[PDB]
Symmetry: D4
Subunit: 203 residues, 8 copies
C-alpha cells in the first residue's frame, strides 16, 4: 500500500500449485514477494513455473523480486545461540533484507562458550535492533538484553529434545528475562521478529 512492506505468503498451509497461483496473481502488483516456510520439495515444483524465484535453502524462504538496497542508515543484528537455530535465523535475515534492512549475522555465540559473544559484542551493540534467536535454555536472550541498550526481540526456537518442549522452555525463559528491554515473539517465528525489527530499524 502506502507502506513499502512486501507481500508475504505463508507457504505452509498452501500447496506448491496454490503458491504459483498466489505468486502469479501478485506478480503484476509491486514490491517483492516473500514466501516463508516453503519446503525444498515445494520449490522444485515452483522452479519451472517461477523461473525468477530465488530459494534460500536454510531459511526455507523464497523471494521473487530484486532485493531492495538498504533503505536506513543502520543495521539489524541477528544473533544466534547455536547452529541448530540457523534455519529460523536465516528466515529472519532474509525477511529483514527483503524489507530493505542491512543485516549483521552473529551466529553461534551461545552461553556454553560465552567468550564468542563478547568477541562480537561490538557488532551487536552497534546495531539499531538486535534479534536474539535461541532454543533449549534460551538463556542467551537474557545475557544479550543486559549487555545492549537497544531494542531486543527474542525468538524461541523448537530445537532440542526432552524438556525443551518444542520451544516452550525457551519461550518461557525469554519472557521471564523482558533484564529489561527484551520483547518476545512466538516459537520459530523469525519472520515476525524481523517484521517488527524492520519497523524499528526504519524509523
Amino acid at each position: 500500500r502506502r507502506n513499502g512492506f512486501p507481500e508475504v505468503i505463508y507457504g505452509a498451509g498452501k500447496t506448491a500449485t496454490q503458491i504459483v497461483g498466489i505468486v502469479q496473481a501478485l506478480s503484476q502488483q509491486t514490491l517483492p514477494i516473500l514466501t516463508t516456510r516453503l519446503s525444498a520439495e515445494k520449490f522444485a515444483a515452483l522452479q519451472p513455473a517461477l523461473p525468477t524465484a530465488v530459494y534460500h535453502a536454510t531459511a526455507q524462504c523464497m523471494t521473487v523480486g530484486e532485493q531492495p538496497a538498504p533503505k536506513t542508515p543502520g543495521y539489524i543484528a541477528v544473533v544466534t545461540a547455536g547452529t541448530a537455530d540457523q534455519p529460523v535465523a536465516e528466515e529472519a535475515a532474509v525477511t529483514a533484507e527483503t524489507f530493505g534492512n542491512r543485516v549483521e549475522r552473529v551466529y553461534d555465540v551461545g552461553v556454553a562458550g560465552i567468550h564468542r559473544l563478547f568477541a562480537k559484542l561490538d557488532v551487536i551493540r552497534g546495531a539499531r535492533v538486535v534479534i536474539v534467536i535461541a532454543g533449549m535454555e534460551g538463556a542467551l536472550a537474557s545475557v544479550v538484553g543486559g549487555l545492549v541498550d537497544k531494542p531486543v526481540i527474542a525468538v524461541p526456537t523448537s530445537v532440542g529434545y526432552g524438556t525443551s518442549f518444542q520451544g516452550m522452555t525457551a519461550l518461557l525463559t525469554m519472557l521471564n528475562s523482558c533484564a529489561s528491554g527484551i520483547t518476545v515473539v512466538n516459537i520459530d517465528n523469525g519472520f515476525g521478529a524481523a517484521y517488527s525489527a524492520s519497523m524499528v530499524n526504519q524509523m
Copy 2:
C-alpha cells in the same frame, strides 16, 4: 548511566525502608521510578520522601520533577477493559518517567469495537503502540492488523477459570506476532514501556 535512562527500583521484594535507602544512595542519579509499590508500603514511605509522587492505580512512585519529554512523538497505551488499567498505568507512568509522551486509549476491547475505530487516528499517529488486554487477548490482533507501527502486547492476569491468570491472553498475543506485534511477560507494563521508550527515542 551513559544511556539516559532513569534509575528503576523493583519495589516488590523490598520494604519501605529498603526503598528509601536506595533513593538516598541514588540522590546523584535524573528521576527515580519505583514499580510495584503497594499503598501500605508507600504510606510508610511518604514521610521519608516528601517530594515523591505516588500513582495509586499504577502502583508506581516517582522521585523528581520530570523535565520536558525527550522526543516529540508519543507512545499509545491501549487497553481492552478497565480491569487492565493498573498495568496500563504502570506502562504509562513508566513511559512518561523515561521522557516519552503518552496518549492513553483505554477500554476499547473488541466486545464494543466501535470504540476502537473512534480512537484509531490517535493510535495510528503513535510512534509505538502498547496494547494491554486480558482474558481473550484479541485486542492485540485487531490493533496489530490495523497499524503499521511496532506493537508491543502486554497480557494481564485479569480473570479466573480458563484465563489462567493471563496465560491465555499471552498465548493469543504470541500467535499474532506475524502482524507488527511483539510480546512481553504477563502484567509487565514496565518492560513494555521500557522497550517502547527505546523505539520511540531513536
Copy 3:
C-alpha cells in the same frame, strides 16, 4: 428416528472396508448418510463399492443420498479466518447442508485484514446462526460475537505451529470471549458445531 437427522459415520476409527459394511447396512434405512474425517485414500477404496457416493475433498466428507432441499426460512453463516481453516469449514458446511440448511460461506476474513470482515458483515448479520472457524489466535470469534446479535458457535482449529498447540490457544481464546453470545466446540469439530447450528436454525 422421529427426527430428520441423518446417520453419521465417524470414518476415522473405521477402515475403508468397515465403512462399506456400515454404509451398506444403513443404505436400506432412510435419510442420507454422512461420513466425516474420511481420507482421500479411503474414498478410493469406496468408489467401486459405493458408486453413488459423493466425496468433498476439502471437507474430507462423504455423502450418500440426495442432499435435502433447504427446510427452514433462514441460513447459517460459516465464517472463516483464513484459508487453512477451509477443511474444517467445509466439514461444517457439508454437515449443515446434509442436515437441510442453507449455508452462506464467508471465508478468509481474519482480523489481520479486518476490512474484509465488514465487507461481508451484512451477510453474517443476516444469518440465523453464525459458525466462526479460526486457528492460531482465534481472535475472530470475539470480534464476530460483539458485532452480531445471533447465536455464534466457535470452532477452534489445529492449524498453526509453535504456541498454537494444535488448537489449544484458539480454544482458550474463544472460551474466554463466551463478548457474550459465543459458544464453543472441541478443536477441529466443524461437524459438532453444524449439528448444533442445524438445531438452532431449524426451530
Copy 4:
C-alpha cells in the same frame, strides 16, 4: 438497544458505588441485571437501590419488575449436584431476566442416574437445555445423547485435586460436542443463558 436485551453489569471488578452509578445512568434502559455481586457489596448497595432484588445463591441483582416472559417456551437448567447451584442460579436468573421461562432440574448427576430419567420429560420439553456440572463432566454427555435439542454445557470449578477448578469438567464437555452439545467458559452461567436466550427467542 435495538435487540431487546436488558443491560448487563459485570459487578465483579466494580465497587458498590460504581454499580449504583451505572444504574442511575441507565435509568432510561428495561431491567438491569448485575452478575457476580457479593453479599458484602450488595449490603453497601441495598440502601441505594431500594427497589432492587438480590438473589443470594446466584450472586445476581435485578433492577426492575420483570414483565411477562417473551416466549412461551422454556429453558431447562440442569445440574449434576447441589454444589453447582450458584452458577446454575446465575444462569437461571439471567435467563429469566432476559424474558425466558426457566425450569430448574437440579441435582441429577449420573451417580444416581435414576433422578435424571424421572425428570427427562421436563428436559426434553425444553427449547434449550443448559447442563451444569463439575468434577466429572459426565452429565453433559448423558443429556446430550438423550435430547434432540441444543445443549449448552457449563463446567463449574467445584472440587480440588484433579478437577483443576473446572478444567477437567470443561475438557469432558468439549469432547461430547458430537452430540447436541456446545460449551462455555468455566462457571459462565451468564454466557450460557445469554446464548440460550437467543436460541429460545427466535
Copy 5:
C-alpha cells in the same frame, strides 16, 4: 512362582528377534506366555520361529500356551464405550482369559446411545468385576460406577482428536468420578486393569 500368573512380555521395547529369544528361554518353564503390544509385522517375524503362537490381531497380543480353563466361579465384564476402544478392550480380555478368567464382552455401549447400556445391564451387574474402557469424554465409567455394586476398573484410551489429548481427558474424567467404587489405570493399559481384575475375580 507359587502364584499361577503367566509370564508377560512387553513386546513394545523389544524387537521381534529379542522376543523369540525371550519366548524360547521361558518356553521351558511353566504356565502360558502372554506378549502385549506386539505389532502385526512383529508376529510375522515370529510365526516361523514360534509356530505354536496365537496372535489376536485386534488386541495386538500373542499367546503361546494352552489357554487355561476358567478357574473361578464368576466372570469379568469388559465394557466398552465405542468400537475404537476395541483394541485395548481385547488386550484386557485376552489378558483376563490368559489368567484363567471368564470374560463377558459388553462392547459399544457409550452414553451417546445409553439405551444400549441398559439392555446389557443384567450382564454387567452379574460380573464380579467390571472393566470399563472408554476414550474422549470417558463418561461411561461414571455412569457404570453408579449403576453397579461391584469393583469397577476404568481404562482411559488414547482414541480421539483435539482436546482428547491422547487419553488425558478420559483419564481425568474417570479419576474424578472414583460415583464411588471406580478405580483407574494408566491410558491404554488394558493389561494392567485385567491383571487387577483377575486378582479380584480369583479371590
Copy 6:
C-alpha cells in the same frame, strides 16, 4: 440399600446444620459416615449428635456403634510418610465403618526402605492393600511389585513446587499399574477404601 453399605455424607460442601439434618432423616439407615468434616464444623455439630464419634486426623464422623467386622480378612493401609496420615486415616476409618478389618502400616516410605520390609508380612497377609503417598509416588511401585494382591494407590497433595499438590504422585502411580496397582483421585482415601471394601468382602 440392598448392598449392605452404610450411608455416606460428603460433609465438605455442607454446613454443620445440613449434616445434622441428613443424619436425622437417616435415622432408619446401619452406621452413618461423614467424610471431610472440619473440626470447626464438628464443634457446631457435637451438641446435636451426642452419640457421634469424631476422628480428628481423618476429618471423619461416625454415627452409630459399629458391629463386628463382616469379614475375617483385613485391608492394609500403607503410607510413605506421616504427612499422609490424614488421608490414610480417612481411608482407614472408612474401611472400618464399612465393616472391614484394617491394619495400619504407616510411615514406610522408600527413603528408609528397611521399615517396609519389616512390615512386609503384615502387608502380604492383607486381602487388599491401599498404598498412600505424596511427592514421589514410589511407594506404590515398590509395594505393587512385592505383593500379589490388589493394590489401590492413593496420591496425596502433600508438598509444594514440582509435587503439584499430588499431580506428580498421581502420575507416578498410574505408571506402575502394570503391577497389581490401580489408582484413585488425589487425596481420595474414601474412594480407595470403598473399592477396597468391595474386593475384601466378596
Copy 7:
C-alpha cells in the same frame, strides 16, 4: 550413622513441640539441623533449646556448636538476585552444618553480568558450585559454561505470572545439563547442599 552426616529434621510438617521431642531423643546424635522452620514456630521453640541457633533468612535451626570444617575445599553458593537469598542461605547453612566451607557469591545475575566475572575467581576455585536462581534460570547456563567443576542448579519459586513458582527456572536449568550442570527440586537448597557436601568430601 556410619556416614558422618548430622541428623536432619524436616520441620515444616512438624509443630514446635514435635521438633523439641525429636531433638531430645537425638541428644546422642553430631549437630542437629532443622530446615524449613518458621519464626513463629521457632519462637515457641526458643525457650526449649536454649543452645539453639536460628538463621532467620535460611529458616534453619542448628543444635550444637559446629566443629571445624571436615575438608579444606569450599562450596560456592551463587545467586542471581537478592530474592533467592532464603533458599541460598538454606543451602549455605546446610553445607556448613555438614562440615563444608562455604563462600557466598550472591546477587550476580546476568542482568548485570559484570558482577559475575568480578567473582569468577572465587567460583572457579570452589570444589562444587551451587547456582540458585528464579524467573529466568539463565545464571546456571552461564556458570555451567564457565566452570569445569560440578554445578548443582537450584530453581527458586520467586515471581508471578509465567515464572510459575519456579517451573520456568527449573526447565531452563534442566536444558543446560549438557554443561557441568545437575538440577534439584524447586527451592530445595538443602538437597543441593546435601549432594554438594558428598562431592566436596570425597
Copy 8:
C-alpha cells in the same frame, strides 16, 4: 584445553556430512572425539570418510580416538531400571568411559522385581558416583538414593506410553525424591549425567 575433557559433537542437529567436516577439523587437535545422538544411517555415511571411527549401536554414539585408560581409583555405577533404558544407559557409559572413568553396569533392576537390585547392591554401593536411569514411574532413583551414601545422578528417559509423557513423569518423580542425595538431569540426557559423574569421579 587445560582440562582433559574430550570434544563432544551433538550429531542430532548436524548432517552426516557436516559431522565429517567437524570431525576432520578437530582430528588434528588432541584427546578423543565423542559424538552423541548419531543415527545408525549417519554412521554408514561416516564409515568411508572416518574409517577409524567406532560406533556403539545401542548408545547411538561414535568415538574416534583410543579410549583413555581409567584415570581415577574408582568406578561409576550406571544403574538401569529396564531394558528399554539401555540406549541412554549406554550413552552415559560410553561418555563416562570416553572421559576416562571405569564404569560398572547394573542393568534391569527396576522395582517391579526389586530383589535384582539388592543382589547387585554391593556393586552400586562401591561406586563413587551412581547414575540411575529409569523411565515411566522412575521410582528406582528414590529407592537407590535412600540406599547409597554416594552422589546419585538421576536420568529420566522418554520410554513408555500414555501418562509417561515422553519422560515428564519420570522427571517429576525423580526431582521429588532430591530421599536426599539425588540430583537430576534433563530427559534422556545420559551424556550430561556422565559429564557430571566424571567430574565427581575425577576429584
